[PDB]
Amino acid sequence: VNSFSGYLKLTDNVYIKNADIVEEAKKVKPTVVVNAANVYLKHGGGVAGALNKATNNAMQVESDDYIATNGPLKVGGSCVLSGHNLAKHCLHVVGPNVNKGEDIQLLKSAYENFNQHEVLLAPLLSAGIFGADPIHSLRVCVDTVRTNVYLAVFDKNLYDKLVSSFL
Numbered sequence: 001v002n003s004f005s006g007y008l009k010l011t012d013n014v015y016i017k018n019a020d021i022v023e024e025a026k027k028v029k030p031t032v033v034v035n036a037a038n039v040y041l042k043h044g045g046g047v048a049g050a051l052n053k054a055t056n057n058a059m060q061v062e063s064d065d066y067i068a069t070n071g072p073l074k075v076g077g078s079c080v081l082s083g084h085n086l087a088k089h090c091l092h093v094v095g096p097n098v099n100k101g102e103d104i105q106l107l108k109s110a111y112e113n114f115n116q117h118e119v120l121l122a123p124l125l126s127a128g129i130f131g132a133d134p135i136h137s138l139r140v141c142v143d144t145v146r147t148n149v150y151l152a153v154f155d156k157n158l159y160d161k162l163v164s165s166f167l
């Protein structure tokens, strides 16, 4: 159960590994995997596309039914849906996309959603094509998340810069 291996403990509750979140989910089958979602839960590329592809589109069919019944999420918000073959649950969290002009103050609100779950496997919110400074996103995670978070960052160059900045 939550058999995370090869992580480096940065703080009492934040761990980090250079790994693909999809491969980690397949090996660990954690209680919760966090998806770096958008407000309409359309998993078209990046982390969301890769998680959805690993469920063979089951995540997208379920997300479409959630949107039809509940409407879109807000930036900074989340919803809990099935984790299918990857996890018991998937927590879909919307971080701000600064490449499309959304406010960075909402990154704290996005990480706050992690606090409803004791243990999570997660990506670095708003990083990559969402345009936030990835080291800043790690600082927000460390300052906001109190529950136990295992971050998978699929880039050794970024992993090394994050660990070097953190110490």
Ligand SMILES: CC(C)[C@H](Nc1ncnc2[nH]c(-c3ccn4cnnc4c3)cc12)c1ccc2c(c1)S(=O)(=O)CCC2
Binding pocket: 019, 020, 021, 022, 036, 045, 046, 047, 048, 050, 123, 124, 125, 126, 127, 128, 129, 130, 134, 152, 153, 154, 155, 158
């Ligand atoms: C900063 C990056 C290093 C990091 N990337 C990732 N971090 C962790 N696990 C990952 N798996 C893959 C992947 C991507 C194509 N794939 C196709 N088949 N399998 C895969 C597997 C990407 C990836 C990252 C962190 C957050 C966000 C992004 C990217 S994003 O650009 O998707 C926008 C949303 C926020």
